[PDB]
Amino acid sequence: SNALMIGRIADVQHGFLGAMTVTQYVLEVDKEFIVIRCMDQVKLGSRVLVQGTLRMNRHVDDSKRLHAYPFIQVVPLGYVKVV
């Protein structure tokens, strides 16, 4: 379950997920988007090459449909590279 994409940085979030900070990006491909999660510099509008683990992260909504809230996980072998 490895992913690799290239696109423009559309949005940047500095957030929290249980006693740990996290930086997230909205990556605009071609036109679609996917969230990048990280547990010369990466800026707003940066055209970047991203590689990491693709998580589907399916959740139930309170029918009770089951939708996907997918994102790319990034850690030594995961990276976000400006280009």
């Epitope: 940047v12 979030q13 957030g15 929290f16 997920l17 249980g18 996290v22 997230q24 909205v26 969230v35």
Partner: nanobody, 127 residues
Framework: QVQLQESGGGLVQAGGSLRLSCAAS????????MGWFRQAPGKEREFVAA????????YYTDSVKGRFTISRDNAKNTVELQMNSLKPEDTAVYYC????????????????????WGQGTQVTVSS
């Protein structure tokens, strides 16, 4: 676009309690992280509390931990600030804010990242 309408504030004595309510209307579909901010005169907006879209994740400024509680009801498109054990320190104009960053579980803690703002509700605590 998006309106955030606030209520529940007012004047109370110290040790007293209030329940703030932020109601969202407009295109609530684009809203994800919700947060409460406050501003005392002279000083600038400080982060009080914020909550993820799924409600699973919350973050509090140190001074309000244990005293204030944040929850949300997405079906009603509302977020609440349960304020217990109010201190005079807590006197400020309280604002709710909404974030457009499309994420379900991650809570936004940076102020410049919140994209929509309420008009503000006055909270005064007398000692």
């Amino acid at each position: 676009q998006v309106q955030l309408q606030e209520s529940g504030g007012g004047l109370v004595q110290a040790g007293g309690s209030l329940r703030l309510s932020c109601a969202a209307s407009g295109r609530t579909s684009s809203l994800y992280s919700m947060g409460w901010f406050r501003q005392a005169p002279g000083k600038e907006r400080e982060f009080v509390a914020a909550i993820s879209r799924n409600g699973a994740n919350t973050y509090y400024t140190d001074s309000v931990k244990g005293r204030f509680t944040i929850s949300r009801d997405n079906a009603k498109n509302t977020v609440e600030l349960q304020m217990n054990s109010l201190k005079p320190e807590d006197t400020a104009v309280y604002y709710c804010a909404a974030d457009r960053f499309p994420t379900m579980e991650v809570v936004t803690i940076m102020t410049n990242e919140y994209d929509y703002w309420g008009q503000g509700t006055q909270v005064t605590v007398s000692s």
